[PDB]
UniProtKB/Swiss-Prot annotation, chains A, B, C, D:
The lineage of its organism: Eukaryota, Metazoa, Chordata, Craniata, Vertebrata. GO terms for cellular component: actin filament; cell body; cytoplasm; filopodium; lamellipodium; protein-containing complex; stress fiber; striated muscle thin filament. The keyword Ribosomal protein does not apply. It comes from Mus musculus (Mouse). One of its GO terms (molecular function) is ATP binding. In vertebrates 3 main groups of actin isoforms, alpha, beta and gamma have been identified. The alpha actins are found in muscle tissues and are a major constituent of the contractile apparatus. The beta and gamma actins coexist in most cell types as components of the cytoskeleton and as mediators of internal cell motility. This is Actin, alpha skeletal muscle.
Length: 372, 372, 372, 372
């Protein structure tokens, strides 16, 4: 035992690797697919369930299901499939010899992390393991100790403020609007063009349309009006069956749901008011260094022109005398894993594991103690 | 028991052999002939009914009847004659010792296959037997597991799409236009030349004219116009009684019924639109590998220039960005039997038989379970 | 030009008249007779060939030949004689001034109608002409637009179904059994009584025996058994030379060939199964109004008791829930000409002619276009 | 101008009448039929296309096509024929003098309603017109202001929840399974009995079989097992040509597609889970009054025993502490038109029209404003 696995199971995409590297060696969608047709050939009981990209490669004949929804593991039997796939089929590593570092979102149910720990100890028998917080690990990546991290992933969007080492948990804001809810809204606003995507396979096509043609408009009604002369903004996409679709003002209406959650019928505030309300709940003296450090993480923060709209629209809320600075690293998509590969290689951390025997005498509630 | 019989009873031509060989050892027309004149000699009660080629050799004095029409066995007493002829007079094999593999078309009546099984168990007492699907066995021949098989035989034309082992039965398209309906249309369009074929014996002469002089025009009205200078296209045929007939633009009008079913007063679509409508009913992601694998089977797919017209006329329907590939093996006429000789020699299949005793306790509905 | 000639050249009897009248003014047998003995008087080169009733009046010294057989003109030089006789010697009309309306049977050779048109334009130089279909004109007579017409003439028997104006050409059934084949069978079954008719002159005597003493038995074996007490059914006929013949059960065996074509060694179905198979080839919704309209035409449908046997024996085939109605007009013998005298006097038809000049620039294939 | 036309063009059946009455004075199938045979009579260019019941009366010779599919008008030239037929040939009304009230399904393409408005103003020049939502008008009929309307018609099935006047558009669920897809599945499961319906005319026969012999089984496998003793459940139907067919367990397998969309190879949920998922997407406090008001509309909700299965199978999903009440009015088949005849006679609505001049200065996008 000299190296430690770092496994970030996001709600839509698993990223696993070794502690020490600057990039995960395994990045694959956290999907489990079951065949839904007959299978007339002789490969009948052959691969009764697929995981990873075989779930995505053969997705034309499968029902795809995500075991994680809103950062909460809803299907515990598929999560074991995905973990078994990561350890054995993707990293090619015996879990017996390496401590593992998992991550999860704040304000999750207590039973989620407990069952995580129980599975990791009593099924993979890892020597040690540690469950970190996804918004703390995004500061380890940026080499900071101060900032308010807005981590918008695939299931959950959370703002976490952190002063010089100290987190203020009474100002952590969680919101259940993320990338999957934008995929769902794009699937719905595309019907008014005539395109109908219903299957779970075509959901993965709309996700790819979104990751390629969607951007965040710096001003919404202004772009909505310049979309009336609907040729300077329409992009065309090529479906897998050769058909081409022409998406116009849906390119910025889909990510506007981040700033107008009323589009999908949610009574909440945008990610710009949730991050402002989180700074205004912190102490009056740290309030100035949180404006100057707005670290963004997760894939849903990779829309072209999201850091400019955040910077423009928080400045409209904050007092006009000090500066707002949105720090968007170019690799923020993996910014949670990088931090995990950092925290796990620090010598000062080598004593903050949870050892198998320590888990024995203390029970599955031992994981709740670890700095909460 | 070490070898298994493979008996493909098409609607117009029986092909039987042993599982393991690469060609059937028995290929004969599935006809039953009854004498229709007096018989003044002493061979009066001698061979009151003929089957096979004696039905075809002595066809000048017989009424010929096909027991199968449109893949449906309409005369159950003649089918037993044909089976008894295949087992005893053609393969020279006691059915008691060999399991048999029959085939039938999709979307047939349920009673057809049930009565098949009942006859094969309670009259020939085969040890085991299995009823496969004719469009799945055409992929076993081509060594594929993906493709849309267009199997045009003598009574039925069906498109069946099959992704990587899995069939999509909601897109199977059956059409009751096949080789016999083209023989009938050629018998009718030949009257405008003056030639009148009416008897069931002369039907078998028009079938031979069709199998020798008929082709599929790559463009219909273009060839129909180049047939006005009616000497560069007219072929002559020699009847059995020495007379010669001169067939001209009937050489491509007869197989055009496959692409224009309105010629025989049918409100349907050609085999090019039925195969396109079958791919467009499949899932959007498998839709690309079905264009690149259009396996053709059956004798009615042996007209010179049918794979080029299919490839040319599906490309006019599919999106212009990906390739259409019609895979026409040179022995596709037996492509359903070869597959049966393959599936029956696989060890993984040796447990998918239906044993006589298994048929006893379960009843004749046991055959409907077998992967449907 | 104000009136149009209507010339129906049947295969055995020409009926010509003027469009507008309700009966043809010229009805004569379509026979050409050549003298076959020496002619010792001085009228040597006097009338080297006879046509019409002089062919029939002087038939004791002539070889009689029909130029039309099975609705197909086999002797093109005698058909010109018959047409020249109709126009000049029977109607007494210059063809130059009147358009003509010819008729022919369905499913005839294409060259027949083309040569008809060529002769009528380049020999008689009619201004206009039109070639209609004999089974459509039988509905114009009955004032109907729906029904299945069974037109049994002297050479051909065809069933043609016609819904509300629209013909279904894929269900037209032609059969080459007609009145001449019944004359031939009566000539043969009369030998077992001892009477031998061989000459073409005595063929015209057997035809007259048939038209007077023959009927259709409502039940065949029943009448065949009541013919054993062979006095309640035997009728006597007086030959031209004063001899009397006694015909018994040949009175209903000759017309039974219409319902049992196996009598003359034909492998076909009766006129009752050919008309039932023609309705069952039509669409399922028009199938009900074709049972209720079975219009009969032609002379061969004038046997006493043929409409009752048709009505009785189709009812045995059709489902027992709806009614069969055989509509036998009392003048059906001319029912094809009446229709022609109707269609030719309709103003909506005056533009559907084929004008001499229109035939010039289009060629003899112009006549194939006319609603086929 | 004192009365207003109410024209509900469903995807399979047009219902038009006057605002104020309690029933439409015009109910006819929205079909356009083109003759597909020759037409040998003189009524050649006579009624080159039929609409309404002449499309259905003469359907034995026509190709029938629905201009609307899944609530989307696909053939804009036939929809004008159907509208011209409704106004002039069915209501006998000059459109110039009456405002009209059209309806359409939710989540349709934007261009559909725009082209509707454009045709109604620039072709029929109605003074005013209004396009309502089909699920709101079903509450006007029931005299309610609260409920979740499940409107299953011929092309589309939509759940729309409506609290006390306010609709929640983020929970509207549309599904493209409706009566036509059940007709298509019945056409397919009838082949295993031997009955083959292919034409568009026989599609209208299978629709009539479905509307008369089909019911919804309260428990599926239980009825499927009691269908093994297949005489206590088999009903016989009489085809138009007198033949009788015996339909057994297809009587409840066809409407089971509403609750098991996997039968036709759709990856969706039944109408019982789509209506439960729509209530669970609404706010937690209105959730109780939506269970107690499940208003059903459309013809596809007229199967015997559908309101009991819905009530039984939602109760299995909802919490067991409160009551589920399916409100199925006895005239729900017209429940969308009645509402239109109500909303159009309300004085508070007389100012919510779209006047011709108001459409002039605002363009065809004026219709999108009207409460969306
Ligand atoms: N380039 C991109 N532009 C917009 N959205 C993206 C992009 N890449 C990924 N996404 C969205 O981000 C999600 C993945 O983000 P990630 O942070 O990996 O989620 P998780 O934290 O659950 O692993 C995907 O669901 C996708 O919809
Ligand atoms: N060389 C050929 N060209 C065109 N048609 C052919 C040819 N050979 C056979 N056929 C047609 O194909 C039919 C036989 O096809 P096959 O696939 O053997 O039918 P089945 O599946 O019923 O056995 C015959 O009816 C014949 O009309
Ligand atoms: N009264 C009758 N009874 C039976 N057969 C008749 C009668 N009159 C004529 N025929 C037969 O019908 C034939 C004439 O029918 P017709 O319809 O005039 O023929 P075509 O259509 O060729 O003119 C004759 O050959 C004759 O044998
Ligand atoms: N009594 C019935 N039982 C079952 N289905 C019916 C019945 N009546 C009509 N239908 C089905 O409902 C459809 C008509 O429903 P309707 O609500 O009028 O459709 P639309 O909204 O398109 O007008 C028809 O296609 C028919 O298949
Ligand atoms: Mg994450
Ligand atoms: Mg075959
Ligand atoms: Mg005639
Ligand atoms: Mg409706």
């Amino acid at each position: 035992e000299t190296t430690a696995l770092v496994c970030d199971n996001g709600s839509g995409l698993v990223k696993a690797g070794f502690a020490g590297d600057d990039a995960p060696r395994a990045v694959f969608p956290s999907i489990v697919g079951r065949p839904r047709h007959q299978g007339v050939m002789v490969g009948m009981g052959q691969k009764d369930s697929y995981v990873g990209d075989e779930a995505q490669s053969k997705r034309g004949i499968l029902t795809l299901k995500y075991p994680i929804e809103h950062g909460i593991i809803t299907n515990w039997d598929d999560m074991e499939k995905i973990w078994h796939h990561t350890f054995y089929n993707e990293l090619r590593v015996a879990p017996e010899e390496h401590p593992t570092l998992l991550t999860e979102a704040p304000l999750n149910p207590k039973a989620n992390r407990e069952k995580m720990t129980q599975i990791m100890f009593e099924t993979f028998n890892v020597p040690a393991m540690y469950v970190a917080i996804q918004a703390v690990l995004s500061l380890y990546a940026s080499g900071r100790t101060t900032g308010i991290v807005l981590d918008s992933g695939d299931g959950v969007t959370h703002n976490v403020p952190i002063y010089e080492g100290y987190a203020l948990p009474h100002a952590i804001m969680r919101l259940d609007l993320a990338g999957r809810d934008l995929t769902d809204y794009l699937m719905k606003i595309l019907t008014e063009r005539g395109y109908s995507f219903v299957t779970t396979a075509e959901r993965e096509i709309v996700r790819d349309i979104k990751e390629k043609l969607c951007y965040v408009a710096l001003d919404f009604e202004n772009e909505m009006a310049t979309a009336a002369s609907s040729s300077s903004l329409e992009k065309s996409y090529e479906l897998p069956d050769g058909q081409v679709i022409t998406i116009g003002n849906e390119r910025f209406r889909c990510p506007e749901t981040l700033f107008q959650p009323s589009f999908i019928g949610m009574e909440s505030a945008g990610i710009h008011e949730t991050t402002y309300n989180s700074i205004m709940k912190c102490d009056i003296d740290i309030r100035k260094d949180l404006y100057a450090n707005n670290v963004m993480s997760g894939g849903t923060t990779m829309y072209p022109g999201i850091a400019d709209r955040m910077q423009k629209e928080i400045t409209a809320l904050a007092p006009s005398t000090m500066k707002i600075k949105i720090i968007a690293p170019p690799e923020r998509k993996y910014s949670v894993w990088i931090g995990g590969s950092i925290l796990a290689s620090l010598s000062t951390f080598q004593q903050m594991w949870i050892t198998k025997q320590e888990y024995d005498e203390a029970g599955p509630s031992i994981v709740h103690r670890k700095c909460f």
